[PDB]
């Protein structure tokens with residue numbers, strides 16, 4: 001049992017990798033996870049970076065990297081017992097670190113098969129959230145978007161619902177791995193829960209109604225599903241928000257007597273700035289749509305109906 005070990009910068013149990021190092025997929029292996037972990041822990045701790053071309057296929061070369069990191073850590077834990085203040089323990093991971101952490105968790109969780117990551121990141125920055133908010137990802141897969149958002153924001157709670165057996169199972173793991181690795185790096189996340197469920201179900205009806213921020217990746221959703229979703233969103237509170245990959249109402253909705261009951265009567269819809277250098281499987285750059293529950297649109301229309309002048313114009 002030849003092995004490599006990395007010490008936690010905050011004294012959690014060490015990460016232990018068997019030799020020879022496992023490959024995760026055609027683009028990810030333990031070797032580079034190790035290397036990358038070291039680089040990121042160095043970003044967490046400037047002194048560690050100060051204190052610190054490799055052959056990822058030589059055990060001795062890789063052990064010289066680990067020992068060197070591990071000694072630098074010991075040395076840093078000593079420095080903190082002195083007057084130097086330890087790394088503050090309650091912080092959120094930088095975006096960079098979070099990217100690594102999520103890659104790492106994926107690798108250790110999903111054993112059989114994240115440009116989204118960058119998009120989600122853009123959305124986290126545009127969509128201000130606070131401790132008032134409840135976030136849900138509808139059709140949450142293995143959970144990566146809940147985890148990312150839960151790591152980055154103050155929402156009071158974050159949920160993901162997913163109905164298929166496979167992804168839901170991985171999600172149970174992704175949850176354990178995530179908490180484990182976040183403890184390893186000494187970072188906080190907001191509360192979250194990843195659940196099995198169908199978000200079209202009667203329980204979810206009320207839950208959708210009380211959620212203030214919904215992400216849903218509905219591009220390939222069919223008419224029936226998008227329509228059922230519209231009927232769920234109709235019950236949401238003023239200022240509720242939905243971010244999606246396909247808009248649930250037209251962007252220039254003009255309210256009139258034929259379309260009174262359409263969901264565009266009750267929501268502002270905007271196209272969100274795309275991410276430069278993004279390109280979907282289609283070939284077109286990726287755009288995203290923000291809907292904000294705003295029932296003043298319907299109010300003003302009905303006001304207008306009462307005003308004979310404004311009534312004639314329309315008419």
Ligand SMILES: CC(C)N(CCCNC(=O)Nc1ccc(C(C)(C)C)cc1)C[C@H]1O[C@@H](n2cnc3c(N)ncnc32)[C@H](O)[C@@H]1O
Pocket residue numbers: 116119120123137138139140141142145161162163164167197198199200215216217218243244245288289
């Ligand atoms: C492709 C989507 C939908 N989703 C998985 C995607 C993983 N999560 C995201 O990608 N979130 C996200 C990403 C980007 C944005 C932006 C901000 C718009 C860019 C917003 C949200 C399919 C999963 O839904 C389940 N699923 C499908 N239908 C249901 C259902 N009816 N009930 C429960 N789960 C369902 C399926 O079983 C499948 O497991």
